[PDB]
């Protein structure tokens, strides 16, 4: 029974091609204007010149779940950004490689 399920893919990005950007992804958060609640953080543009792009090969409009093991699935967009900024850098250069858990919604409208 698999139709409209969402899968979590984990990309591990070493801080090698880092400096060009951190990972080289652009993310943004959106809010449901109807639900008056955040939809979470989604990828908007991949920077083709960053380790996450090179190694991970992630996509646009994917939904960011967790970063370096720390999850943002549950906290608001502005909260999430703080968690990201802090963990992507502070724990990123700490681990040496940064772990990104992103979610893929099985739907045809996906890029």
């Amino acid at each position: 029974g698999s139709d409209g399920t969402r899968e979590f893919l984990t990309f591990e990005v070493p801080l090698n091609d880092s400096g060009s950007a951190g990972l080289g992804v652009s993310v943004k958060g959106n809010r449901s204007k109807e639900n008056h609640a955040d939809l979470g953080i989604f990828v908007k543009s991949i920077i083709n010149g960053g380790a996450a792009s090179k190694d991970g090969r992630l996509r646009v409009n994917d939904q960011l779940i967790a970063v370096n093991g720390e999850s943002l699935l549950g906290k608001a967009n502005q909260e999430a950004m703080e968690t990201l900024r802090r963990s992507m850098s502070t724990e990123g250069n700490k681990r040496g490689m940064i772990q990104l858990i992103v979610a893929r919604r099985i739907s045809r409208c996906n890029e």
Binding site: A21, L23, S26, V27, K28, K33, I41, K44, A52, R85
Partner: peptide, 16 residues
């Protein structure tokens, strides 16, 4: 060229 989406949002983007 104007009026894209609908809402007072500057699109909160974060680049990693």
């Amino acid at each position: 060229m104007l009026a894209e989406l609908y809402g007072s949002d500057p699109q909160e983007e974060l680049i990693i």
